[model samples]
Target: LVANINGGFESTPAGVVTDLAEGVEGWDLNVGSSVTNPPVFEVLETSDAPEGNKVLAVTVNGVGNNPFNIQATALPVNVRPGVTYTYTIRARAEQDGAVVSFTVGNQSFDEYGRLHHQQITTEWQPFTFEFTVSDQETVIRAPIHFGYAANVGNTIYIDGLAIVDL
Candidate 1:
């Protein structure tokens, strides 16, 4: 698994996380100008989590035209050319029909390795997709967009996010 993500929202390999604001180690929050009020990002202890006791929660205070306006982004991971990788996540929304997108690409965000859009309901659901790396790319970042298609006051929960080389 070249994709070094904390799938279970557990402690990092180095040590246990005392305070994870936006996301656990290896992940961070990206807030864009489209938002009127900044969204709240927190780690919540809940029984609803898919794999562990903790889940990343985003409280959407505003909406915008671009989904990328609010995102939980995993840091760049090394990739080998022509290698295929699968990304998976467990997620749910406060309301039905909330939309979110998962995308993997380079730092410039111009070329996509894989892109998937998912409509989330109140119950947790798993989203997964696979993509092969190109010869020109050696690293990639995966970000889950949560801005567009979601209404104000909507809270989104996500856990068990990971990527593995296959």
Candidate 2:
């Protein structure tokens, strides 16, 4: 089994109760920037959510930054070497044709490194990424990262992020 447990971002937070009360647990907010004004992260109410009542909203500042991130903790998985795994999720942008990346495994901390780096357009598309566990001597924690960093003046909505062992 994959280590990712909170796929729906339904793990609610305390005190604050809105549409996105349950922020995406197991996964943290990762902003890929040290620029002056990065993107804003919010669990906003929406009609476009593919699952649950709300979605993670990434609002960009139009400062040439990619205001997008849904990153899990960097940890190895419990599996034998040479085992293949697949990760999946649904996402969209306010505008059309937004390019996003879906990555798993060791490069979670690396900004530009990913085992499966594919560019997808905007809309609620189900994207899949597959990779093999090359070694078991050490643990290979497979986490899901749905990342997008377009130019500016854009908002991306993501929900139903999940990972499964195949």
Candidate 3:
């Protein structure tokens, strides 16, 4: 059976998706955290995407210590305690050198289980971050970041986000 359900932006229209649909809090742009100014979130159709039909576009104003992150508090698959989940997503940025990272749930550790960092380029790139569910209440969310650079006008495109039990 499929474990990851809503990771892909297919169940919704060609617009922005939020954590509110999954009855969770702190999963939308309203809950985003940035080292600098607030970030802007949007969804783009294939006509506007870098590759896929739909993508989550997170735009950071600029000059930040760490890129802004937006996480979803919902999940299509159930997160069980002690279950290993492999999280992945397709991402890119309008400008190169974007941070481009992911975080699973509300954990004390980093998203990659280590202090990992992946920079974004103009081309689409696939990123993977694996984690095991510590509790049933743990949310299966994918948070995306634009970058840690002080540069301005950066947009990170996110697609194919998933968290599968491995």
Which of the numbered candidates is closest to the native, going by highest TM-score?
1
Lowest summed lDDT across 10 adjacent residues in model 3 is found at: 19-28
lDDT of 2 at 149: 49
**Candidate 3 residue-wise lDDT, 1-166, digit = tens:** 4355545565556655453344222234443344446556666677655444766676666544434433333343456778777776777778777664455554433343422567778887777767776654444444444445533577777777666778
What are the runs in model 2 whose C-alpha is more than 4 Å off? 13-24, 62-80, 107-122, 137-149
Query: For model 3, what is the C-alpha lDDT against the true structure?
Result: 0.56
Ranking by lDDT: 1, 3, 2
Window of ten residues with lowest summed lDDT in model 1: 14-23
- Estimate the Cα RMSD of every predicted model relative to the unseen true structure: 3.5, 5.0, 4.3
lDDT per residue, candidate 1, 1-166, as tens digits? 5475676666643232344333366786767776778888777777767887888778888877687888887876678778888888888988887778888887778555545567888999888888887757777778788887544688888888778888
What tens-digit string does per-residue lDDT give for candidate 2 at 49-124? Answer: 7887666666556443332333333333344566666766777778765555555555334321244444445768
Error of 3 at 25 (Å): 12
Tell me the lDDT of candidate 1: 0.75
Instruction: Please state the error at residue 40 of candidate 3 in Å.
Output: 2.6
Off by over 4 Å in 1: 12-23
Candidate 3 shows a clash count of 1
Candidate 2: deviation at residue 8, Å?
1.6
Instruction: Rank candidates, TM-score, best first.
Output: 1, 3, 2
